[PDB]
């Protein structure tokens, strides 16, 4: 996929995807003059070329494409990023003890520091949209991420991470304030609120646990 990730993906093709000089240059050669001066970079002599190149990711013009825009994917995706680039062995020694890990593990702490600044900068525009229909089970890990990356949770990203983090905080307390007087979510299939007691209690528990942290 030329240009790599139009909006969603992290991958792209910049300065490491070369220019192959020995092949029949596929498309956008509107005119035959485009052999000695293809003059790509011009925006119209580029949309002709860039579109027919490595598939502008569409799975096949009717095949099933992935649902990456939704909070039900981005945030349990970001769970695996920091749960891998920072294994719990770093999380334990950071969360529990304040003592210095070591230079190596301090690099692995900063190696993943600027790995969040990547998956954020790429998939931030998506996070704000599905914030509307985002669910509390997923609005609750947004603070629980920047811990394993060891960052204090509270255009450029900083302007937009703030307003979003302020935006989510209210929507969490709304729901938590919507829980104390919770209507009947299911009078059928589960009219007895079981597993909803502890799981939503531990939410209210684990929500304020990060507040002092943040």
């Amino acid at each position: 996929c030329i240009s790599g990730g139009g909006r969603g993906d992290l991958f792209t093709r910049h300065a490491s995807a070369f220019k192959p000089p020995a092949f029949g240059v596929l498309r956008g050669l509107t005119h035959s003059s485009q052999t000695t001066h293809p003059q790509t970079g011009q925006l119209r002599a580029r949309k002709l070329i860039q579109h027919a190149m490595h598939d502008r990711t569409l799975s096949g013009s009717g095949h099933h494409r992935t649902a990456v825009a939704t909070w039900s994917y981005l945030l349990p995706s970001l769970r695996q990023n920091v749960e891998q680039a920072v294994p719990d062995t770093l999380y334990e020694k950071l969360l529990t003890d304040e003592v210095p890990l070591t230079p190596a593990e301090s690099r692995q702490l900063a190696d993943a520091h600027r790995l969040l600044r990547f998956e954020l900068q790429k998939r931030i525009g998506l996070l704000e949209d599905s914030l509307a229909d985002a669910a509390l089970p997923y609005l609750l890990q947004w603070p629980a991420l920047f811990q394993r990356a060891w960052l204090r949770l509270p255009g450029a990203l900083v302007p937009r991470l703030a307003q979003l983090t302020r935006h989510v905080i209210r929507c969490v307390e709304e729901d938590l304030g919507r829980l104390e007087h919770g209507s009947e979510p299911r009078e059928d299939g589960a009219p007895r609120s079981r597993r909803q007691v502890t799981l939503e209690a531990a939410w209210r528990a684990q929500w304020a646990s990060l507040l002092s942290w943040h």
């Binding site: 991958f11 910049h14 300065a15 095949h63 099933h64 990456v68 680039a85 600044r117």
Partner: protein
């Protein structure tokens, strides 16, 4: 070149600083707000190995390439253009009635690629073929003894059969239950 000896650890990147063969970290020129900042090339690849592998597995398909189907590919293709677009309920049904081997090849593959999807959590009903291709495969060679001392080499061509079963919920199917009328003179005897 030898990756076991010419590249001991691919996470590293050997340089020469002050005539010292030092091996720093390997990075990548990942993207930013408009800058290019280097991130760990082992970390940059742990995402893609997962964020992609975790992208596809949550796509309602079952991609399934069967290699080395014993048949020529030029003949296999012509009898896969029939199945293009057919729903799996009416592809296993129309491969089981045609006479050609290429359809017996698909049916056996369209069964192994059908139960495999069940363990993948896809329904057996709303399965519908999405992509089914034919690549040339490895070939054999019989000697072909001919007259007057001549000879040739009968090549026994095989092929590959790449197939992906998409899943569409709203796939409504034409009625095939409809018994004919002349058979509905089963009233006699019952």
């Amino acid at each position: 070149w030898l990756t076991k000896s010419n590249l001991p650890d691919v996470n590293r990147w050997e340089k020469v600083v002050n005539s010292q063969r030092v091996t720093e970290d390997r990075w990548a020129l990942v993207e930013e707000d408009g800058v290019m900042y280097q991130v760990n090339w082992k970390m940059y690849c742990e995402r893609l190995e997962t964020e992609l592998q975790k992208a596809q597995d949550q796509l309602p398909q079952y991609s399934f390439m069967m290699k080395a189907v014993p048949s020529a590919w030029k003949k296999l293709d012509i009898e896969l253009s029939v199945l293009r677009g057919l729903s799996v309920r009416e592809a296993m049904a129309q491969c089981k009635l045609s006479p050609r081997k290429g359809h017996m090849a698909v049916f056996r593959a369209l069964e192994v690629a059908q139960q495999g999807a069940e363990g993948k959590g896809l329904d057996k009903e709303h399965l519908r073929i999405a992509y089914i291709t034919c690549m040339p495969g490895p070939t054999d060679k019989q000697v072909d003894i001919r007259s007057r001392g001549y000879y040739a080499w009968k090549t026994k061509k095989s092929s590959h059969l790449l197939l992906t079963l998409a899943e569409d919920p709203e796939m409504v199917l034409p009625d095939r239950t409809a018994i004919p009328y002349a058979s509905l003179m089963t009233m006699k005897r019952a």
